[PDB]
Antibody
Framework: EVQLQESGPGLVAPSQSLSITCTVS????????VSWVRQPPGKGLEWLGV???????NYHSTLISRLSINKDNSKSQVFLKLNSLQTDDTATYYC???????WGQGTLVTVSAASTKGPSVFPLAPSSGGTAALGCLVKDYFPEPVTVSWNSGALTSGVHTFPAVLQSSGLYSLSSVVTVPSSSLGTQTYICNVNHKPSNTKVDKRVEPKS | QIVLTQSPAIMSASPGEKVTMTCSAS?????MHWYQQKSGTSPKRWIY???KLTSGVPARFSGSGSGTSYSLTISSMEAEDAATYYC?????????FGAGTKLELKRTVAAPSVFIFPPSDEQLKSGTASVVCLLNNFYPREAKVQWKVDNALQSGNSQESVTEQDSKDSTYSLSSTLTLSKADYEKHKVYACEVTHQGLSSPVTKSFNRGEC
């Protein structure tokens, strides 16, 4: 099927230019245009621009002075470049294929002079036919985002992964929990799989009742 | 440069209610499109060319309008319909979006199930202390959490966040973290999170005693 995949830096310093690649498949870049859209955290959608089949480009008037879009048809790749960066350019960036019907998964780019930092993962152990809760705390990482699954995606029912909070230190913290039957705490294994792509930091943390 | 104004900004509908949201443009538009977005996912093309449904969209959705006036209607609200809806136009060089309508499922009251988690020995060995309080599967969204340490009210040293409404049971969950130094944690005994919510006749306190295994 038609697929669009973004590759982006995650963290970029405001002294740099933001550069994102979108690799497409399933349609002709020579025939169809590709657009870029962004969404700041907690806010709405903003169209940035488009590159058409023949290479012509259109940009949003408010940002026309900062944006540049080009492409390589032979590689089925589209390139976005955003200049004059500020912290308020932090957003999820999407490439969007024909008819605006196929969207990439989106890549969260953070504009900051701070440094990348991978998280520590701590267990939230179930307390000592009854429902029990367990989880993990993903503490002190930068920038967003972190993803969390349980038992390598085998456990989805009852899972709640919460929005991250920004601590006073400038680092984020996130929790993920799951509720299970209390009768399973002694016989099932519970593992939270944490991925912090901006730092290529991955952790698998087993959570068990405290001894 | 065509501005799209969506109304209402936020609405809640009970199961089976007819829902209508509106999108008005500053200039005439030939076609209006609508996208649905749920927590942590790309927007999905939902209605296009004003009144056409993308494959897989339930037939209770419909779209209508002309000129500067458009609308999206759900004949009978369902839990899976809770989401943010954005109108979108491209009748000029610059594509624009509305600011969105956030649609919630109005269900019965559900009291939170409350759980408290001490800092792990791993964290303590690493040199920090976090206490976590979970309020699970409650409705409506409004809820208050108060942290107490040896009956001292904690103010300004906790943070909290809330999930989006569950697509199945239409509830919310909330996680709150109290941050202490290891020395502070180790010099106090009783850790409590007290929860106020419409589903509770009186605030409920979940607590633990540090050191008690």
């Amino acid at each position: 099927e038609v697929q669009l995949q973004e590759s982006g830096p995650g963290l970029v310093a405001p002294s740099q230019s933001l550069s994102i690649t979108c690799t497409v498949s399933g349609f002709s870049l020579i025939s169809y245009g590709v657009s870029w859209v962004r969404q700041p955290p907690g806010k709405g959608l903003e169209w940035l621009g488009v590159i058409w089949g023949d290479g012509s480009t259109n940009y949003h008037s408010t940002l026309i002075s900062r944006l540049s879009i080009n492409k390589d048809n032979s590689k089925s790749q589209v390139f976005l470049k955003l200049n004059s960066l500020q912290t308020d350019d932090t957003a999820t960036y999407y490439c969007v294929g024909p008819r605006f019907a196929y969207w990439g998964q989106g890549t969260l780019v953070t504009v900051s002079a701070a440094s990348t930092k991978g998280p520590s993962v701590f267990p939230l152990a179930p307390s000592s036919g009854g429902t029990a809760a367990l989880g993990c705390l993903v503490k002190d990482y930068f920038p967003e985002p972190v993803t969390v699954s349980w038992n390598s995606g085998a456990l989805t029912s009852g899972v709640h992964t919460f929005p991250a909070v920004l601590q006073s230190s400038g680092l984020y913290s996130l929790s993920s929990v799951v509720t299970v039957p209390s009768s399973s705490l002694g016989t099932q294994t519970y593992i939270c799989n944490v991925n912090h792509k901006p730092s290529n930091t991955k952790v698998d943390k087993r959570v068990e009742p405290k001894s | 440069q065509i501005v799209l104004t969506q109304s209402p900004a936020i609405m809640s509908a009970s199961p089976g209610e007819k829902v209508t949201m509106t999108c008005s443009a500053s200039s005439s538009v030939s076609y209006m499109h609508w996208y649905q977005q749920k927590s942590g996912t790309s927007p999905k093309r939902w209605i296009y060319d004003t009144s056409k449904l993308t494959s897989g969209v339930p037939a209770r959705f419909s779209g209508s309008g002309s000129g500067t006036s458009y609308s999206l209607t759900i004949s009978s609200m369902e839990a899976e319909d809770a989401a943010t809806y954005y109108c979108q136009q491209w009748s000029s060089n610059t594509l624009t979006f509305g600011a969105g309508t956030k649609l919630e499922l109005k269900r019965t009251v559900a009291a939170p199930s409350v759980f408290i988690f001490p800092p792990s020995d791993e964290q303590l060995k690493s040199g920090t202390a976090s206490v976590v309080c979970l309020l699970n599967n409650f409705y409506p969204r409004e809820a208050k959490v108060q942290w107490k340490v040896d009956n001292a009210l904690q103010s300004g040293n906790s943070q909290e966040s809330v999930t989006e409404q569950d697509s199945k049971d239409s509830t919310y969950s909330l996680s709150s973290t109290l941050t202490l130094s290891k020395a502070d944690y180790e010099k106090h005994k009783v850790y409590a999170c007290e929860v106020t919510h419409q589903g509770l006749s009186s605030p409920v306190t979940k607590s633990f005693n540090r050191g008690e295994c």
